[PDB]
Swiss-Prot record:
It holds the Pfam family tRNA-synt_1b. This is Tryptophan--tRNA ligase. It catalyses: tRNA(Trp) + L-tryptophan + ATP = L-tryptophyl-tRNA(Trp) + AMP + diphosphate + H(+). Homodimer. Its EC number is 6.1.1.2. ATP binds at R10, P11, T12, G18, H19, G154, K155, D156, L192, K200, M201, S202, K203, S204. GO terms for biological process: tryptophanyl-tRNA aminoacylation. Coiled coil: none annotated. L-tryptophan binds at D142.
């Protein structure tokens, strides 16, 4: 009666506070729920859809290390959940090809993320790779190879999983019922704003606070935190609405009555930003300290990182063999000869 959950990330580097708020907290909630069996993909094949230079591919090993350390440090549990490496699941390549054959190109090119990449490519006199166009087909293979029931994804990925549902329906219609139609689990509409107040917090915008930033670094990034540009002087009445300083206090400062007093004094102008910022840094550091302590243990004994990925990959490999046996039984391309050739 247990439902399968699958979600994860391309390995791109260290995790930041936006990852925690936007997706990691929900992944812990799902993992701790007895109704679910969680699979967390480290999607190294998907990095090739945009990063193919040898120097970029070389860094994937490092990115996987950083992902495992951050995931385990916040409590993603490798015995309860299956943390696995996408490229290490041999069946993914064949299921990807099968689904490619079942997906009309016009159903991919209308996906808003793909449409935007295609418009930018044309603008720049480039052409997207066949593999990048196939991004949601490969993601559909990830989800359905696990026969997942529930898929947490960010807003820009929901349409990918809508394609996954259509691929499951097409396969089941043509060849008989094999795949659950996955349900999308939606996140918040507002990703956490970055430290410069310009868009979401992201590695590429260089406006992130990383879960692994040390105390001094958190202090410096909060010191330079974008606030209210109209608050010219320390005595000027300020705006709390839209203000990253108070967006962060609400999320990370547990002392609710202090935050409400700061907000009032800020609107009245009778508080220095240094007071509100020093306290924000103190509370983010207190929030981060237990992560840092566990991450330090994992970095000191990397066998825990290796065991995590070994255990999860072996669990996903088992599931993938069982799923593909069912796929072969229902699709049955050259079934007799492939038996003869086994
Ligand atoms: N597309 C996700 C990674 C990913 C690959 N396969 C998935 C399956 C389910 C959820 C997420 C994924 C990302 O942008 O990082
Ligand atoms: Ca081992």
């Amino acid at each position: 009666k247990k439902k399968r959950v699958l979600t994860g990330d391309r390995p791109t580097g260290k995790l930041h506070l936006g990852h925690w708020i936007g997706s990691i907290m929900n992944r812990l909630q799902l993992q701790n729920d007895s109704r679910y069996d969680c699979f967390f993909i480290i999607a190294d094949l998907h990095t090739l859809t945009t990063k193919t230079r040898k120097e970029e591919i070389l860094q994937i090993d490092n990115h996987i290390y950083d992902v495992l350390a951050d995931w385990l440090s916040v409590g993603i549990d490798p015995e309860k959940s299956a943390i696995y490496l996408q490229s290490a699941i041999p069946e993914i390549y064949e299921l990807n090809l099968i689904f490619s054959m079942l997906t009309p190109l016009n159903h991919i090119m209308g996906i808003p993320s793909i449409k935007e990449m295609a418009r930018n490519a044309s603008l720049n006199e480039e052409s997207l790779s066949h593999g990048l166009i196939g991004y949601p087909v490969l993601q559909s293979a990830d989800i359905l190879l696990a026969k997942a029931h529930l898929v947490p994804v960010g807003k820009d990925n929901e349409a990918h999983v809508e394609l996954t549902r259509d691929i499951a329906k097409t396969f089941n219609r043509l060849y008989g019922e094999v795949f659950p139609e996955p349900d999308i689990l939606q996140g918040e509409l507002t990703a956490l704003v970055g430290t410069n107040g310009q868009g979401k917090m992201s590695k590429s915008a260089n406006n992130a606070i990383y879960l692994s930033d040390d105390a001094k670094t958190v202090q410096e990034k909060i010191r330079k935190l974008y606030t209210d540009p109209n608050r010219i002087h320390a005595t000027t009445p300020g705006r709390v609405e839209g203000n990253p300083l108070f967006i962060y206090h609400d999320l990370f400062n547990p002392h609710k009555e202090e935050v409400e007093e700061f907000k009032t004094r800020y609107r009245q102008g009778c508080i220095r930003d240094v007071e509100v910022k020093a306290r924000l840094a103190e509370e983010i550091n207190l929030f981060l300290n237990p992560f840092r302590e566990k991450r330090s243990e994992l970095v000191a004994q990397p066998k825990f990182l290796e065991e995590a990925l070994q255990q999860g990959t072996e669990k996903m490999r088992t599931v993938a063999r069982e799923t593909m046996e069912e796929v072969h039984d229902h699709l049955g391309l050259s079934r007799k000869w492939r038996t003869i050739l086994a």
